[PDB]
Amino acid sequence: NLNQFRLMIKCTNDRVWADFVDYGCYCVARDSNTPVDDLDRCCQAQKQCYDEAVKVHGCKPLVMFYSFECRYLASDLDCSGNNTKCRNFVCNCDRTATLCILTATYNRNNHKIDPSRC
Amino acid sequence: NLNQFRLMIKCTNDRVWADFVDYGCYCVARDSNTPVDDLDRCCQAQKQCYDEAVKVHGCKPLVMFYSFECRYLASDLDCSGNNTKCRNFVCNCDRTATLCILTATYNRNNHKIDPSRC
Amino acid sequence: NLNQFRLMIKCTNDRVWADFVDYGCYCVARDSNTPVDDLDRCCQAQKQCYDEAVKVHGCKPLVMFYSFECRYLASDLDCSGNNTKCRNFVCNCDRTATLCILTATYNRNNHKIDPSRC
Amino acid sequence: QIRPAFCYEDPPFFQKCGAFVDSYYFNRSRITCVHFFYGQCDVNQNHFTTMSECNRVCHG
Amino acid sequence: QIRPAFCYEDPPFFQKCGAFVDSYYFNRSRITCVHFFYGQCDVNQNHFTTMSECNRVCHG
Amino acid sequence: QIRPAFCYEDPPFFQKCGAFVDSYYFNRSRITCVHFFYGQCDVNQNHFTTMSECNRVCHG
Amino acid sequence: VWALCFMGSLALLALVCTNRIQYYFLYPHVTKLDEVAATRLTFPAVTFCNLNEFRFSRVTKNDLYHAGELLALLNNRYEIPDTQTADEKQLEILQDKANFRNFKPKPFNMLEFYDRAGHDIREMLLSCFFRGEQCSPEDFKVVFTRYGKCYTFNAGQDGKPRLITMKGGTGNGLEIMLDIQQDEYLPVWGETDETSFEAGIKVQIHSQDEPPLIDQLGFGVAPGFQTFVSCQEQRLIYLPPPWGDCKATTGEFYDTYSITACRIDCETRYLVENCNCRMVHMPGDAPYCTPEQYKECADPALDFLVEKDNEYCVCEMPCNVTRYGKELSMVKIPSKASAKYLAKKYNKSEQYIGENILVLDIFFEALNYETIEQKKAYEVAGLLGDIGGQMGLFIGASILTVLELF
Amino acid sequence: VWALCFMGSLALLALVCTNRIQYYFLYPHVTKLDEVAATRLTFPAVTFCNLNEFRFSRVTKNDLYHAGELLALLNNRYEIPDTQTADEKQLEILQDKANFRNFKPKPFNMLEFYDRAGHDIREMLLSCFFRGEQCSPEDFKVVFTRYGKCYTFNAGQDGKPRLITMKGGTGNGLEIMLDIQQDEYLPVWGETDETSFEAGIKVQIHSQDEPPLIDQLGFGVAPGFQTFVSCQEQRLIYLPPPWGDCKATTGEFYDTYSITACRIDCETRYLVENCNCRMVHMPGDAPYCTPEQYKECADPALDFLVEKDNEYCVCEMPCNVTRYGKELSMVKIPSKASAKYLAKKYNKSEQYIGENILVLDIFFEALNYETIEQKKAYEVAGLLGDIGGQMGLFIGASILTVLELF
Amino acid sequence: VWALCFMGSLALLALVCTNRIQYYFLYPHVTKLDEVAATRLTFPAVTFCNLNEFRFSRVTKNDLYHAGELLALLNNRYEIPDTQTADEKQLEILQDKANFRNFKPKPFNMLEFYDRAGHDIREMLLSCFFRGEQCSPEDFKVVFTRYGKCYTFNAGQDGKPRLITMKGGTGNGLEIMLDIQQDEYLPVWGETDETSFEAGIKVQIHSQDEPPLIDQLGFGVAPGFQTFVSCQEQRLIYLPPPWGDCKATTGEFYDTYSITACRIDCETRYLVENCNCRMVHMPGDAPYCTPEQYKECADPALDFLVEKDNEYCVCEMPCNVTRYGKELSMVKIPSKASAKYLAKKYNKSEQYIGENILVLDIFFEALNYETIEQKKAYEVAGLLGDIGGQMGLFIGASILTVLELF
Ligand SMILES: [Cl-]
Ligand SMILES: [Cl-]
Ligand SMILES: [Cl-]
Ligand SMILES: [Cs+]
Ligand SMILES: [Cs+]
Ligand SMILES: [Cs+]
Ligand SMILES: [Cs+]
Ligand SMILES: [Cs+]
Ligand SMILES: [Cs+]
Ligand SMILES: [Cs+]
Ligand SMILES: [Cs+]
Ligand SMILES: [Cs+]
Ligand SMILES: [Cs+]
Ligand SMILES: [Cs+]
Ligand SMILES: [Cs+]
Ligand SMILES: [Cs+]
Ligand SMILES: [Cs+]
Ligand SMILES: [Cs+]
Ligand SMILES: [Cs+]
Ligand SMILES: [Cs+]
Ligand SMILES: [Cs+]
Ligand SMILES: [Cs+]
Ligand SMILES: [Cs+]
Ligand SMILES: [Cs+]
Ligand SMILES: [Cs+]
Ligand SMILES: [Cs+]
Ligand SMILES: [Cs+]
Ligand SMILES: [Cs+]
Ligand SMILES: [Cs+]
Ligand SMILES: [Cs+]
Ligand SMILES: [Cs+]
Ligand SMILES: [Cs+]
Ligand SMILES: [Cs+]
Ligand SMILES: [Cs+]
Ligand SMILES: [Cs+]
Ligand SMILES: [Cs+]
Ligand SMILES: [Cs+]
Ligand SMILES: [Cs+]
Ligand SMILES: [Cs+]
Ligand SMILES: [Cs+]
Ligand SMILES: [Cs+]
Ligand SMILES: [Cs+]
């Protein structure tokens, strides 16, 4: 779930959990159609990953637990330790989404916007 | 039984067990009708206690075992440690009888008398 | 078997195992009719013992195992430690045969002779 | 009250504050005095040098 | 690469090379710094005198 | 009687009366000499400095 | 030639006083073994759990509605799975209980469910004796564990005195007869953290200063036997810094530090941080996990921390540890000659008694406890005394000559 | 200025020689752990008891007349209680045996009854091996205990040599196969000190220098199993006064002091003092308790002393103690594939073998025994040597200067 | 008067320096106990054996021809004995298999027979978990023992890493569920070294540095139970000559010296020397024993050495020993409520599961291991330092005065 994502995020970068919380349209894990920029485009990929996690496999990405190992290199962040497909799958969604966060840049005014913006 | 009475007695007073053994008419635990003085009146209360122990409850006051705790004060002599009514009851007969001994006084010539005296 | 005989022999005397191996006609445990001297007469007694071990009891003197204790005196060599009649019996054949070896003398030219000699 | 109140106090069994020595104490279960090894722990007064002394002071 | 690579190294727990002292180390499972007793075994650099210093260098 | 009577005596296995040293003793079960560590307990004479010496005196 | 050797004498003396001063500041320690003859011993706490968490006859439709899937009685579609392994009777009770047609769910709480459906000391405890005296369900304190609703004898809480042993042997300890109630066990139709292939109880003998960690540190006792558990107390004492690295007190959920207190702190921090809830047996303020959270988050997370994790919880050594060495042994209950007596006495069949009844005896073999203790190896007096001894060795000095030369 | 500091030097020296002299007279000790490699070990004694005290087929009408009430076969009215729990067959044997109509009681003796009705080593012992060699009922000495008629292997009495172990493992120890004879067990119709809810044997492994105290200090072994008991010898040595408080010898019933010898002395003194009789397993001269005295006085008094008393028996520590640490483990007898063989061999059914047969293996895991020993910590030489060392520290004195100045 | 006392002083000094020099050359040692807090522990190897050596369904007519007599299936006349104890079905399979009429024997090999007919880890192992992770028959290495074909978990051979434990308790260890396959057990029609009255497995927990000696040093685990084995690592360290008598390395069959390696060397030397063959579980080059040699020479000789011999094998102490103390305990499998689930899961009856299924849990109670270590008691520095201290005691000398007087 999102406690581990928040932790995967703290593992990779120092940007406090709040700043992603209600950022843009999708962050963190909310539905819309048009993402404001690329940071918000990560969350859509994340959200679209959770949607696939639920439909194909049977996961419950927002409730379920998974484990991950924090290594020195962000890309080294490990998910192989998970004993089930479902638990392995969601751990990757968050892994993918958290690395993608590291690429994109943080435009403050896109955080906590109006619903008329999305 | 009378090994414990003899011990309850040694717990409270120094008068050797012999002196009560065939004292008067009742001491220790013999039957009669008229007690010679009050020491011999204790043993009657004791004897009448054993008689009640046998008829009402089913005790065997002369054979059965009980436990008692010897404390610093004679009145503190404890019988609460006994796990059955019958064992508790007889422990009290001896307790009652042994404290009552402490009140009364020892008139030597009333010890080992003739059966024509009782 | 003959590993223990070879050991019983080494327990009693220093004459190397080879010298008895194909000595005379009977040594060690071969069949014939006329023994060349008394050393070869021991082996016949030994061989005749194994023959009795097989027919009467059911032993297998050449395969079976037994235990023996090596003491300071050759005659003290012990076989009482064996838990079965069959194992006890064969241990004695070798004991008898090995002491008898100590009496007789070793005539070298009677070792490794021709089959036309027996 | 026939014997002192320390008579009913447990000796310092097995406790060492120095040399262990032959001593005697009143046993309130046997109602007589018994031998024990006393190791100089003056926890209470239930320890005598003689069995008889213990049997006078504490026996009754 | 956000925190040094020694941040992911286990401290010398329970190892004594001298005086044990209050110290702090980065826990790579909690992803924060935690108290431990350090006994002067300079096995690695994952030991700080202050929790905050540890939380600056190693937290991210 | 082919070998001495001390040949049949057990060595002082594991007994220390001083320095332990390479030694050899006659094994009356193997009927040959075997290595052991001897610790200067002169309990008997079944201990030699050399395997061969042991194999001469005691082997037969 | 001497002043050229009185100071050479002294130079080597300084490299010795340096080696000794540097050693005092290692603050070394040595370990001392010791037997201790005891006139008496404090009897430990004894926690026990039935291996079965929920009494079948106390599971309502509502409980089955909320927690049925967690106990593998229901699939994800809220129905009894067709791969059920039930008899005729149990299945037709459960198939009716699982009829949620026109049913409206009332609120649910795991802690309330454990407390109500967990096994009852009042029906389990056929008899209890400790040192001659008869004990009762009142002597057992309820404690919640991973097994659910468990009971501790001699918990020494309530403000109650702690019991004492004075002699070696079975007479000076505890003896309990329990009925484990297999007719009340929940049917096993799947494998989850709350199901059991086994029948019996789990037991842990611990100091009252520490909580149970019974799923991890306990022992098993099987029905159909009387089991003897002969114990030895063993006391470990460690030093705090700078000598050692032991933890004197605490400042989290328990008022005395032990390895178990530390682990339960960790497990609770870990479940809140990762599930936003605590299991009903953990301390704190956080909301209790729902049956959904147990299955989805709480069970997998506690399993991970207990099985796979190597970094999250590393516990500092405590300064005081009491270990009980145990030697277990067994005889069979009932004999053929006592089966019908016990059946008659508790109104059960002979087959039942042989399946459900157990006796447990817990006792010390001797008052004698063992102590292994860390002692400081080089106090201040031992630093000065040897500086002193080798002053007289090298320079030939003294307390007198130093004073005089001053 | 020096004589004002040579004596100030000396004053502080006297407060050190005082601290050292006062310490020697504490007679302190320290404890030394040690492993000891052993070429051989003396095998312990092994006492065992059937949990059932009286063979049903050896109880006569006379025995049932005198001891029936004690064994709960009879009520106080000398009749079989209507709350009996018997089969058809046993009850009709007992109801006939309890027909005392026109019966005249012959004399009775508990010791004779135990000796005659107790289980017989000759029928119990199916097989015994020790170190390859076959053992027999002759190797077992009869000993009377609270269980009645029991047997000790390797008692090392009779003037018989004690057996020895030379290697670790099951081959160098004892293996006994026993039939516990449940068809011979006494029916249980009540609860007394002589009745048993359990089937099996009790076992105690002890030095030959000490008696068994098997009801208190033994372990259980259950029928239907082969039980492995791997042992370690452990030797404790204590100091006598003034250093320690251990008891060297004795001057009551046993010729070597041990905690058990002390306890059996106490129990006997206690039963005579309180019942005027001894139980058949205790030593001395006093009359044996009658079945009435057992029920009324002897059982309650021994139970009290063993369960509730804290003052009557407090035992001085002995100077030599041998403890055996034990690790027990089990496998099942019989397998399905060996049941019919064993049935045929002892002429029983397959169900019988599975209920009555047990195998016990008792062995050492290694010759290595452990010693924990109290050593004197400050001998005379250690008192003088340090007075000496700090003479040279303070006053700068010597053995030479003291002699010279004289 | 002084030179007559400076040398008298010195004479007694020489009888002290002699007593100290003579002591250094005893090379004494003392033993040090110590606890060691561990962040992690290497998990031991765990060898297990079925008590049954040969699967009934894998015994061919040829095997029965060569080895039937050794397994008591055949008498010396190559026929099924009339004193057979078989059911209807097994006997009619064996009576047909033993029809050697017009049969011609193919070659035979005991090692091949054990390898082919011994129990298969692939059918025995229902489930294996270690620290959360699922393990497989691939994690078990085949090892041949007196029981035949056995399996070691965590053998740490192959070049595989050794597993580690980090916490106390059942979660951080191994859990295996095994089916012992009693329907596959060989019928017992006699008593030989290869037959078993018992059902279950034998287990040994050992360091990877040493081979198993499981028939001698193992423990039993019975079917029908879950057995808990709580362990403590204990490390013994000894000194080599001249201080001690421990064996550093080896120069016979194993690449690390241990008591077991020594014993297996001995047993092999003994079987070759006395039978001219080795058993299939021993190392070396010598031919494997034939079934005839097993019965006639190999079994009696190994039994003798293991039971009766006191001289052939006496093993030098090794310098490093790892012992695991064990506390065993049990609960019952299956409960009534899980029997039908497990039956369905493995396609067996409920009666079968209760006869063949076992669970084994092996774990540490705490990372804390114990070390008992021999330490050198009087190094060179401790020889000089005390010669020094009592120089200043007697002659009043010093390092300075000796130098100066030179
Ligand atoms: Cl944990
Ligand atoms: Cl007692
Ligand atoms: Cl061996
Ligand atoms: Cs995976
Ligand atoms: Cs009461
Ligand atoms: Cs014999
Ligand atoms: Cs009393
Ligand atoms: Cs006094
Ligand atoms: Cs006197
Ligand atoms: Cs993590
Ligand atoms: Cs640092
Ligand atoms: Cs700061
Ligand atoms: Cs031999
Ligand atoms: Cs020699
Ligand atoms: Cs030579
Ligand atoms: Cs649900
Ligand atoms: Cs509550
Ligand atoms: Cs009731
Ligand atoms: Cs309560
Ligand atoms: Cs479970
Ligand atoms: Cs706290
Ligand atoms: Cs959280
Ligand atoms: Cs030191
Ligand atoms: Cs001097
Ligand atoms: Cs009677
Ligand atoms: Cs007699
Ligand atoms: Cs027989
Ligand atoms: Cs006998
Ligand atoms: Cs009883
Ligand atoms: Cs005596
Ligand atoms: Cs008396
Ligand atoms: Cs144990
Ligand atoms: Cs000291
Ligand atoms: Cs054959
Ligand atoms: Cs091969
Ligand atoms: Cs399968
Ligand atoms: Cs493998
Ligand atoms: Cs066997
Ligand atoms: Cs080698
Ligand atoms: Cs050979
Ligand atoms: Cs056990
Ligand atoms: Cs010394």
GROMACS .gro file of N, CA and C in nm, chain C residues 53-103:
model
  153
  289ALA      N    1   3.271  -7.702   1.233
  289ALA     CA    2   3.198  -7.577   1.254
  289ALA      C    3   3.084  -7.563   1.155
  290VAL      N    4   3.108  -7.607   1.031
  290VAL     CA    5   3.009  -7.596   0.924
  290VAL      C    6   2.900  -7.702   0.933
  291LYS      N    7   2.939  -7.825   0.964
  291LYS     CA    8   2.846  -7.937   0.960
  291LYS      C    9   2.755  -7.945   1.082
  292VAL      N   10   2.813  -7.930   1.200
  292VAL     CA   11   2.736  -7.946   1.323
  292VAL      C   12   2.652  -7.824   1.355
  293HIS      N   13   2.717  -7.708   1.362
  293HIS     CA   14   2.652  -7.586   1.411
  293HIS      C   15   2.588  -7.504   1.300
  294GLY      N   16   2.665  -7.472   1.197
  294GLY     CA   17   2.615  -7.398   1.083
  294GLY      C   18   2.701  -7.276   1.055
  295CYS      N   19   2.819  -7.275   1.114
  295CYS     CA   20   2.909  -7.161   1.105
  295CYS      C   21   2.957  -7.141   0.963
  296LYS      N   22   3.019  -7.027   0.937
  296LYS     CA   23   3.087  -7.003   0.811
  296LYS      C   24   3.224  -6.945   0.838
  297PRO      N   25   3.315  -7.029   0.890
  297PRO     CA   26   3.444  -6.993   0.947
  297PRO      C   27   3.528  -6.901   0.862
  298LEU      N   28   3.506  -6.901   0.731
  298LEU     CA   29   3.590  -6.820   0.643
  298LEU      C   30   3.531  -6.683   0.615
  299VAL      N   31   3.403  -6.666   0.645
  299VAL     CA   32   3.336  -6.540   0.622
  299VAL      C   33   3.303  -6.468   0.752
  300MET      N   34   3.249  -6.543   0.847
  300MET     CA   35   3.200  -6.487   0.972
  300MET      C   36   3.303  -6.407   1.050
  301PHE      N   37   3.252  -6.317   1.133
  301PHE     CA   38   3.335  -6.235   1.220
  301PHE      C   39   3.331  -6.294   1.361
  302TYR      N   40   3.441  -6.281   1.434
  302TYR     CA   41   3.437  -6.301   1.578
  302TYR      C   42   3.529  -6.201   1.645
  303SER      N   43   3.514  -6.185   1.775
  303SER     CA   44   3.605  -6.102   1.853
  303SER      C   45   3.689  -6.188   1.948
  304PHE      N   46   3.809  -6.140   1.979
  304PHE     CA   47   3.897  -6.206   2.075
  304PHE      C   48   3.978  -6.100   2.148
  305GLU      N   49   4.017  -6.130   2.271
  305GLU     CA   50   4.102  -6.039   2.345
  305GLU      C   51   4.245  -6.092   2.359
  306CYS      N   52   4.339  -6.006   2.324
  306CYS     CA   53   4.480  -6.039   2.326
  306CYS      C   54   4.533  -6.006   2.465
  307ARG      N   55   4.577  -6.108   2.538
  307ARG     CA   56   4.636  -6.085   2.670
  307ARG      C   57   4.786  -6.107   2.666
  308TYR      N   58   4.851  -6.080   2.778
  308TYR     CA   59   4.996  -6.092   2.790
  308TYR      C   60   5.046  -6.235   2.771
  309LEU      N   61   4.972  -6.332   2.823
  309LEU     CA   62   5.005  -6.473   2.801
  309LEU      C   63   4.921  -6.531   2.689
  310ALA      N   64   4.987  -6.592   2.591
  310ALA     CA   65   4.919  -6.655   2.479
  310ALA      C   66   4.801  -6.742   2.521
  311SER      N   67   4.817  -6.819   2.628
  311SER     CA   68   4.713  -6.909   2.676
  311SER      C   69   4.595  -6.832   2.734
  312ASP      N   70   4.618  -6.705   2.763
  312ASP     CA   71   4.517  -6.621   2.825
  312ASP      C   72   4.424  -6.562   2.720
  313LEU      N   73   4.467  -6.571   2.594
  313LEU     CA   74   4.391  -6.523   2.479
  313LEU      C   75   4.246  -6.565   2.494
  314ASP      N   76   4.156  -6.467   2.492
  314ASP     CA   77   4.022  -6.489   2.540
  314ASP      C   78   3.919  -6.491   2.429
  315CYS      N   79   3.819  -6.578   2.444
  315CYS     CA   80   3.714  -6.596   2.345
  315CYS      C   81   3.578  -6.590   2.412
  316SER      N   82   3.578  -6.569   2.543
  316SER     CA   83   3.454  -6.573   2.619
  316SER      C   84   3.362  -6.457   2.585
  317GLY      N   85   3.417  -6.353   2.523
  317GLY     CA   86   3.339  -6.235   2.489
  317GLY      C   87   3.240  -6.249   2.374
  318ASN      N   88   3.237  -6.365   2.310
  318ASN     CA   89   3.150  -6.388   2.195
  318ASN      C   90   3.008  -6.434   2.231
  319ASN      N   91   2.908  -6.364   2.177
  319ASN     CA   92   2.770  -6.382   2.220
  319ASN      C   93   2.691  -6.498   2.158
  320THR      N   94   2.750  -6.572   2.065
  320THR     CA   95   2.680  -6.685   2.006
  320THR      C   96   2.769  -6.809   2.004
  321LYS      N   97   2.707  -6.927   2.008
  321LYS     CA   98   2.780  -7.053   2.007
  321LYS      C   99   2.871  -7.064   1.886
  322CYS      N  100   2.816  -7.028   1.770
  322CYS     CA  101   2.887  -7.038   1.644
  322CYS      C  102   3.010  -6.948   1.644
  323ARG      N  103   2.993  -6.828   1.697
  323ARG     CA  104   3.100  -6.729   1.699
  323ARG      C  105   3.204  -6.768   1.804
  324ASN      N  106   3.156  -6.824   1.914
  324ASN     CA  107   3.243  -6.877   2.017
  324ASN      C  108   3.324  -6.996   1.968
  325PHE      N  109   3.259  -7.087   1.896
  325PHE     CA  110   3.326  -7.208   1.847
  325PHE      C  111   3.444  -7.179   1.755
  326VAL      N  112   3.422  -7.094   1.655
  326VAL     CA  113   3.526  -7.064   1.557
  326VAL      C  114   3.642  -6.988   1.620
  327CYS      N  115   3.612  -6.897   1.711
  327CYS     CA  116   3.716  -6.826   1.785
  327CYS      C  117   3.809  -6.923   1.858
  328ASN      N  118   3.755  -7.035   1.906
  328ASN     CA  119   3.838  -7.139   1.969
  328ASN      C  120   3.924  -7.219   1.871
  329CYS      N  121   3.868  -7.257   1.756
  329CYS     CA  122   3.945  -7.323   1.652
  329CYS      C  123   4.073  -7.247   1.622
  330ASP      N  124   4.061  -7.115   1.611
  330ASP     CA  125   4.174  -7.032   1.577
  330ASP      C  126   4.265  -7.017   1.696
  331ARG      N  127   4.206  -7.019   1.815
  331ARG     CA  128   4.282  -7.009   1.939
  331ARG      C  129   4.366  -7.135   1.958
  332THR      N  130   4.300  -7.249   1.945
  332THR     CA  131   4.366  -7.378   1.951
  332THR      C  132   4.477  -7.387   1.847
  333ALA      N  133   4.447  -7.346   1.725
  333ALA     CA  134   4.541  -7.357   1.615
  333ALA      C  135   4.660  -7.264   1.630
  334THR      N  136   4.640  -7.153   1.698
  334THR     CA  137   4.745  -7.051   1.705
  334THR      C  138   4.843  -7.082   1.818
  335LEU      N  139   4.794  -7.146   1.923
  335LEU     CA  140   4.879  -7.188   2.035
  335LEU      C  141   4.963  -7.306   1.990
  336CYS      N  142   4.897  -7.401   1.924
  336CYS     CA  143   4.964  -7.515   1.864
  336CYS      C  144   5.076  -7.473   1.768
  337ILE      N  145   5.058  -7.359   1.701
  337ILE     CA  146   5.164  -7.305   1.616
  337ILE      C  147   5.289  -7.273   1.699
  338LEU      N  148   5.267  -7.226   1.821
  338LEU     CA  149   5.376  -7.184   1.909
  338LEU      C  150   5.463  -7.301   1.953
  339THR      N  151   5.404  -7.420   1.959
  339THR     CA  152   5.480  -7.539   1.993
  339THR      C  153   5.570  -7.576   1.876
   0.00000   0.00000   0.00000
